[PDB]
């Protein structure tokens, strides 16, 4: 049956776009960091780019160094870079190709639009030219990330009405460039060999329903989804202390929903990750945690590792 | 400054209450809890709890379906919930428009506009107080910048409008509406932003970033809910290595939070063993926003959650 890990994705030589998403606070940032690290360690001759498309960025916080609109290598690694788009500064560097920039810089949607433009300018870079091999997206929570992924479709339909209107109102080739560019992006996003969406969730009632809507929504967009990370699991029966009323009670809830998840998502890689005692922060800890996306965590075997994170 | 939201809960001036914070810290749980407390404490006022998170969870929280039209919470006389579906709202007023980024924030802004108008006219389906279960930090900031953003935007449009049905008047009409929202949103007695957070590293810096940003918009925040606290030293169970180690970390940051935000109502809420859903469990949970949670005394409530 389907192995409970991301080993196939981590060692993949075909995927160019990897979206990590899900409900607020399930562990998208933690998971996207971990996936990006595993791919980087697993494929040393490739260059990877982890971009946060969440307007409230946490990559800088997680690694303990400042990232921005321009990609920077993670300190300590040779092939992993991070980026956190700043709408104001990104529009400024077009401002200083300056009112326009700041105005549009705060309009709702700007963060989704500039993330999309990042994809666009990456497509143009690949064709002509040496750039990042695989790009992993630390996305915003469900609601807005769905907007982002509708954009190839949304812009395509818009650019049809736009063209026939702007030509009679009153440069036309600039439309065709984007119109074709958007298409290219949609082709790659609906290609399961080039693009995939890794869902993150927690085994709690409120995250269950939202995760299922999300997955269905993505499938409707012809977006490949075949992996689900169930994060922050207690595995209370393996503590070998078997006490703490709260932990046993919460694990009972988790385990219950974990059986429901297992049953519905039989055809998905269902990757189960433990709630750690320490902080998943800094290169070392993120790396130590990431290994369990590659080789499934065993509560009986690797039980001590949740207590072995630096402080 | 007392570690509770009693004054906000019993406030008779506030019209706009934003409940926000990082993803997954407890915005939805807290906003429901705040809305119940206020509705219970003020039975003569009508309360509306609106979700501006495109991934709505109010319906899931209460266990009943809500929509764009306000509906009363079953079991409450003066609390209603609203969850606007963009594609379905525009159909009443273009499905591609319902998929455009920012459309969620726009329709939410229009909803605020509808209510200030009806409140001004003393006519129409109205609510005395609107509480917002907001999207996470990033997009909520975009929403609260909208009065400033739209203001500048309508100025520029003025010129390129005069470039070529008496349209200038409608721009002027919008400028005025926006201006009324800006003054109400920046009035500390009418509007406040309640921050929800958890005592963890990634939450601390984002929360601080958020508050500093809200203040630059002349938005009031004097309330911070620190949620999902373990209180391990009070569990009466001095074991479980994970809880002890996790609590030691929570407690460490908790001292820092308490020191920095001394001017704020710092409300501490426990991690529950049960599920906080349904009116009853939400009501029981919400009591600790009005009267601070004593881990030594109120500890039983952690397991008293209906299932």
């Amino acid at each position: 049956t389907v192995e409970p890990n991301l080993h196939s994705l981590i060692t993949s030589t075909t995927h160019k776009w990897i979206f990590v998403g899900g409900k607020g606070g399930v562990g998208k940032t933690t998971s996207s960091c971990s996936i990006a690290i595993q791919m980087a360690l697993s494929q040393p001759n490739k260059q990877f780019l982890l971009i946060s498309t969440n307007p409230a960025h946490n990559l800088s916080d997680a690694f303990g160094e400042k990232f921005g609109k321009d990609a920077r290598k993670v300190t300590g690694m040779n092939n992993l870079s991070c980026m956190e788009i700043d709408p104001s500064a990104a529009l400024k560097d077009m401002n200083d190709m300056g009112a326009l920039a700041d105005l549009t810089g705060s309009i709702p949607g700007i963060d989704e639009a500039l993330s999309f433009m990042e994809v666009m300018k990456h497509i143009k870079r690949q064709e002509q030219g040496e750039t990042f091999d695989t790009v992993i997206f630390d996305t915003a929570p469900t609601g807005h990330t769905l907007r982002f992924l509708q954009l190839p479709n949304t812009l395509s339909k818009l650019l049809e009405k736009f063209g026939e209107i702007t030509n009679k109102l009153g440069i036309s080739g600039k439309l065709n460039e984007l119109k074709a560019n958007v298409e290219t992006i949609r082709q790659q996003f609906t290609d399961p060999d080039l693009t995939t969406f890794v869902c993150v969730c927690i085994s709690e009632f409120l995250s269950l329903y939202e995760t299922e809507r999300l997955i269905q929504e993505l499938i409707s967009y012809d977006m490949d989804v075949n992996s689900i990370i169930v994060n922050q699991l207690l595995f209370a029966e393996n503590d070998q202390e078997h006490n703490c009323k709260r932990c046993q009670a919460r694990w009972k809830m988790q385990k219950k929903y974990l059986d429901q998840i297992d049953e519905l998502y039989e055809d998905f890689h269902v990757v189960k990750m433990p709630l750690c005692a320490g902080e998943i922060r800094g290169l070392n800890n993120l790396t130590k945690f990431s290994q369990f996306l590659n080789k499934e965590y065993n509560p009986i075997t690797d039980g001590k590792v949740i207590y072995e994170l630096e402080d | 400054v007392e570690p509770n939201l009693h004054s906000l809960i019993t406030s008779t001036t506030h019209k706009w209450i934003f409940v926000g914070g990082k993803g997954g810290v407890g915005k939805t749980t807290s906003s429901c809890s705040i809305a119940i407390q206020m509705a219970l404490s003020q039975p003569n006022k009508q309360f509306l709890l609106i979700s501006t998170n495109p991934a709505h969870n109010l319906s899931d929280a209460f266990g009943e379906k809500f929509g764009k039209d306000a509906r009363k919470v079953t079991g409450m006389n003066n609390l209603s919930c609203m969850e606007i579906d963009p594609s379905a709202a525009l159909k009443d007023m273009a499905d591609l428009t319902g998929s455009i980024p920012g459309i969620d924030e726009a329709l939410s802004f229009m909803e605020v506009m509808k209510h200030i108008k009806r409140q001004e006219q003393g006519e129409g389906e109205t609510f005395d107080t609107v509480i917002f279960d907001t999207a996470p930090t990033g997009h909520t900031l975009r929403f609260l910048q909208l009065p400033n953003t739209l203001s500048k935007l309508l100025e520029k449009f003025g010129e390129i409008t005069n470039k070529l049905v008496d349209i200038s008047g409608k721009l002027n009409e919008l400028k005025a509406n926006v201006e009324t929202i800006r003054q109400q949103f920046t009035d500390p007695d009418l509007t406040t932003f309640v921050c929800v957070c958890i005592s963890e590293f990634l939450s601390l810096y984002e929360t601080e970033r958020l508050i500093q940003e809200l203040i630059s918009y002349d938005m009031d925040v004097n309330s911070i809910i620190v949620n999902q606290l373990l209180f391990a030293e009070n569990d009466q169970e001095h074991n479980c290595k994970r809880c002890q180690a996790r609590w030691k970390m929570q407690k460490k940051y908790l001292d820092q939070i308490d020191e920095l935000y001394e001017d704020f109502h710092v409300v501490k809420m426990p991690l529950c063993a049960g599920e906080i859903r349904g009116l009853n469990n939400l009501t029981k949970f919400s009591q600790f926003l009005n009267k601070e949670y004593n881990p030594i005394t109120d500890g039983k409530v952690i397991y008293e959650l209906e299932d």
Partner: antibody
Framework: EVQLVESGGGLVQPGGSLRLSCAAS????????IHWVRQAPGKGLEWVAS????????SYADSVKGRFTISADTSKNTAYLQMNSLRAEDTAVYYC????????????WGQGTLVTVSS | IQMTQSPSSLSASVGDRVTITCRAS??????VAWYQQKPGKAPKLLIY???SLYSGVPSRFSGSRSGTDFTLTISSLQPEDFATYYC???????????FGQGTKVEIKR
């Protein structure tokens, strides 16, 4: 104590309308999916409609799509089936049944209500 | 799109092992359930997920999957096991519910 109770079945002339009701108890239907399955005389089971309040999604069999409408009042813990443009073929015993968000198999059923369509 | 249930009827005696087959037009993974319907009564759920036995159902009932072929096996017919049986598919990629035509298991004498 989980159970589903149908009602509203009766005789309707072709082209007419009829509203079926499925009262649920023992659970909150909001968190579940509710289905209508019918059975023509001497025939087998035929799914006609589903509703899942927790996703705002509804679904219809082609044979009834556009003519029927499924809905739910979550405050009354009751689901409904509005049948318009009825025909002789629509004659059947109509069941309501329950499904789960992770399992679209029907675990609980009502006793069924008889709808007959003829002039 | 169309679930073919066979045979449409079958005679057997108490103690016989019987097998009912349902063939799916397309791959629906393991999302098939089996029901039992007695005259005048609502169907009862027996098996879901092709092979998982539903709560309260006796152990003589069994289900297996072989590709798009699904089987319901009653290892040793009891007097009460005689009824009509329906398979049902509920594929993850769809919101459709599709039943087989049914199998009427009757007593041989």
């Amino acid at each position: 104590e989980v159970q589903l109770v149908e009602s509203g079945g009766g005789l309707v002339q072709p082209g007419g309308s009829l509203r079926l009701s499925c009262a649920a108890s023992g659970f909150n239907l909001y968190y579940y999916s509710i289905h209508w399955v019918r059975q023509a005389p001497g025939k087998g089971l035929e799914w006609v409609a589903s509703i899942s309040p927790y996703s705002s999604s509804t679904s219809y069999a082609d044979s009834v799509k556009g003519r029927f409408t499924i809905s739910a009042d979550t405050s009354k813990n009751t689901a409904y089936l509005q049948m318009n443009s009825l025909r002789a073929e629509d004659t059947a015993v109509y069941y309501c049944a329950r499904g789960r968000w992770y399992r679209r198999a029907l675990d609980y059923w009502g006793q069924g209500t008889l709808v007959t369509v003829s002039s | 799109i169309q679930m073919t249930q066979s045979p449409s009827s079958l005679s057997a005696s108490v103690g016989d092992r019987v097998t009912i087959t349902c063939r799916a037009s397309q791959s629906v993974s393991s999302a098939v359930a089996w029901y039992q319907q007695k005259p005048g009564k609502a169907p009862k759920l027996l098996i879901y997920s092709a092979s998982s036995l539903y709560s309260g159902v006796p152990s003589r009932f069994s289900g297996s999957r072989s590709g798009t072929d699904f089987t319901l096996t009653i290892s040793s017919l009891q007097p009460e096991d005689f009824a009509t049986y329906y398979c049902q598919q509920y594929p993850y990629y769809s919101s459709l519910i599709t039943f087989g035509q049914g199998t009427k298991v009757e007593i041989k004498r």
